[PDB]
Design a protein around this ligand. Structure first.
Ligand SMILES: *C/C(=C/c1ccccc1)C(=O)OC
Length: 139
């Protein structure tokens, strides 16, 4: 088991989170409470080959996804709406996920995760023209 995405990550920066949530139509007071909650984001990943288990948690809330690169799975937008998601590799250490809402119309959502050369995990989340960036380090 060589070094890959696998491991336990804690956030150290969080740029544009508030504006992402605005685009997704979250009200001011909840955006502010979500920004506070976001400085305790922790991520646990177990990666085997193509196949991923990911646990994202804050203080009061936790979610898990399991997916295979290339195969459709069901999950949620940053704002809770169910969606069909599909993950593709973009390079050795970057994956990108396109999301389509199960029900309704709304903004085009996507995320990426990427391991950098100096051992950080970077997560981007996109809603239309707005890009949120979160940097994590090994716990
Ligand atoms: C890693 C991750 C990111 C994410 C961001 C926004 C919407 C859905 C997913 C995730 O969900 O892993 C559980």
């Amino acid at each position: 088991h060589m070094p890959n995405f696998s491991g336990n990550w804690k956030i150290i920066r969080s740029e544009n989170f508030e504006e992402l949530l605005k685009v997704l139509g979250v009200n001011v007071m909840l955006r502010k409470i979500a920004v506070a909650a976001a400085s305790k984001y922790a991520v646990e990943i177990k990666q085997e080959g193509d196949t991923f288990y990911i646990k994202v948690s804050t203080t009061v809330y936790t979610t898990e996804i399991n997916f295979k690169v290339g195969e459709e799975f069901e999950e949620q937008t940053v704002d809770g709406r169910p969606c069909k998601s599909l993950v593709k590799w973009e390079s050795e250490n970057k994956m990108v996920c396109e999301q389509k809402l199960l029900k309704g119309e709304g903004p085009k959502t996507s995320w990426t995760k990427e391991l950098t050369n100096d051992g950080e995990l970077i997560l981007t989340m996109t809603a239309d023209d707005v890009v949120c960036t979160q940097v994590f380090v090994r716990e």
